[PDB]
Amino acid sequence: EPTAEMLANNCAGCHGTRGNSAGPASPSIAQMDPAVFVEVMEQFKSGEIQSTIMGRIAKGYSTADFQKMAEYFKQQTYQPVKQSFDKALVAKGTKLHDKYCEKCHVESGKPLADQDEYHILAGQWTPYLRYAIEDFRAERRPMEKKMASKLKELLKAEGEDGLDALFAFYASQQ
């Protein structure tokens, strides 16, 4: 049976060596929480999460292969990406994250030793985070109701400009 590295080293062409992606859009997956990782792979595979290509890829693997790969990626060190951001919007975005998202995305979802099942926002590629929130808003992938209501409350209060601010804040954490 293939080893974790024999399985995961094929992902580097789209996600970068060790899961640190050079962008501009394919996500970094280094240091993801292993339960998060396995669940997202299973949902791409079943089609619960609609995708451009990950359903086609994840369908090629078993549960056991996802759990091996989750171990590999969890052992890597996530590197916040070097990307541009709108520095003028950073303090606004800090306040928005603090008001709407920090409750669950603790320290912006960084892979902290004492958080389980974090979802990394800080230092992730901004186009990927824009596509993910497009997918939540379209219901192309599921979200807990408690994230849905905060996202809806941020948009009702701040508009699209509120999102630009959140993204500049997450990108500034590099």
């Binding site: 062409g13 970068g16 962008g23 501009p24 859009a25 394919s26 451009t52 290509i53 090629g60 186009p127």
Partner: protein, 400 residues
């Protein structure tokens, strides 16, 4: 302390040298490649279309030297599998315990009557990037508005099945904005081609396909196969007997494994190299592993993602075998992205496994496939951004 020589520093050879050296740094790894700067042919069609600069395709070898690989700029002329020596054009000899051969393709120019290697300086193939990519882009930039561009793919197998058709898309993107009276005519060897339904729909939407003012025409084989050219008159002739005159003609000649694999007795009557798919060891010469375009790894296509995936199998197997360990079970993967225009991209993907007897590679059932024919615009737009991201990531993973 054991020795490996890698012949070829393109996507397969650089990947294999990197992944051997990093798995066991005690191995001495020497990579032989004549060109001191590599040009990726992947993404070169965006250079031919105008939205990418040629220098972005360049890759150096300082990333591999930093991993402890010795890089020798010379060509290998022979490999003696019994004494285990790779002999170079410069007259040096490099001993090995295992040898990895990844020399890409030989282009059979003069299979098209009237064409030749020297004449690729007049009708570029640009199936190997660098000056050829520059030549083809300069010809397009100098072409008078109303001029015809021909693309003539060969019969399979060849390097990057969808590549000619991404190329036509990229050339049409350029004509639509800058030379709108022109058109690209694809004269094919084949009755169908890679991602054909998806490309056709995209050309209907972007480029007028199937209308009198189409920027792209496609003619099927076998009638349309280009069998002759006259480079002075700027014509080609098809197998059906039709002449086409053009202002720019991109002939893509048939291909086989690169010359060193032929002269080292690594090929069979297909013109490609048979291997054990668990290890990429040659079925003909023990101790030599063949990867990348040069090998037969059907159904994997001849692509950079496949070469990089095969290299990782071959590297882990060479490292185990040098150590007296058993190579593990392989896993392989491909994806080829095609950019039809800045907001419109498609892809074909697969995940592969050895079959139950370990004798051939197969696609994993109920997996992989192509961007759907009825994919929504959000998918088509994001695919181009993911295609750029694949390019940056595979380049670093291979050479960085």
């Amino acid at each position: 302390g054991r020795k490996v020589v890698v012949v070829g520093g393109g996507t397969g050879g650089a990947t294999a040298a990197k992944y051997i050296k990093l798995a066991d740094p005690s191995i001495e790894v020497t990579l032989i490649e004549p060109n001191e700067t590599y040009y990726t042919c992947y993404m070169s069609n965006e250079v031919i279309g105008g939205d990418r600069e040629l220098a972005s395709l360049r890759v150096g070898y300082d990333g591999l030297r930093a991993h402890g690989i010795q890089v020798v700029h010379d060509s290998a002329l022979g490999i003696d599998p019994d004494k285990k020596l790779v002999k170079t054009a410069g007259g040096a000899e490099f001993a090995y315990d295992r040898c990895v051969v990844a020399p890409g393709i030989d282009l059979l120019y003069d299979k098209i009557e009237g064409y030749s290697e020297a004449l690729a300086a007049k009708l570029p193939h640009a199936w190997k990037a660098g000056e050829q990519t520059a030549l083809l882009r300069r010809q397009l930039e100098s072409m008078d508005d109303g001029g015809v561009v021909i693309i003539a793919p060969p019969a399979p197998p060849f390097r990057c099945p969808p590549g000619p058709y991404e190329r036509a898309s990229q050339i049409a993107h350029y004509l639509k904005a800058h030379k709108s009276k022109s058109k690209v005519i694809i004269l094919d060897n084949s009755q169908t081609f890679s991602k054909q339904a998806q490309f056709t729909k995209g050309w209907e939407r972007l480029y007028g396909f199937g209308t009198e003012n189409a920027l792209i025409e496609w003619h099927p084989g076998p009638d349309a196969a280009v069998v002759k050219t006259d480079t002075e008159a700027m014509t080609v002739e098809t197998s059906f007997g039709e002449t086409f005159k053009a202002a720019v003609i991109n002939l893509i000649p048939p291909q086989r494994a690169g010359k060193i694999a032929q002269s080292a007795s690594l090929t069979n009557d297909s013109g490609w190299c048979p291997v054990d798919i668990r290890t990429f060891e040659s079925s003909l010469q023990p101790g030599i592993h063949v990867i990348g375009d040069a090998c037969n790894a059907a159904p994997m296509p001849k692509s950079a993602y496949s070469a990089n995936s095969q290299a990782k199998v071959a590297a882990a197997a060479v490292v185990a075998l040098l150590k007296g360990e058993e190579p593990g079970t392989p896993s392989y993967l491909n994806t080829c992205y095609s950019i039809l225009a800045p907001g419109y991209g498609i892809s074909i993907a697969a995940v592969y496994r050895p079959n139950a007897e370990g004798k051939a590679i197969e696609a994993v059932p109920d997996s992989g496939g192509i961007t759907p024919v009825d994919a929504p615009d959000w998918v088509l737009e994001r695919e181009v951004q993911y295609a750029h991201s694949w390019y940056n990531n595979i380049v670093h993973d291979t050479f960085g």
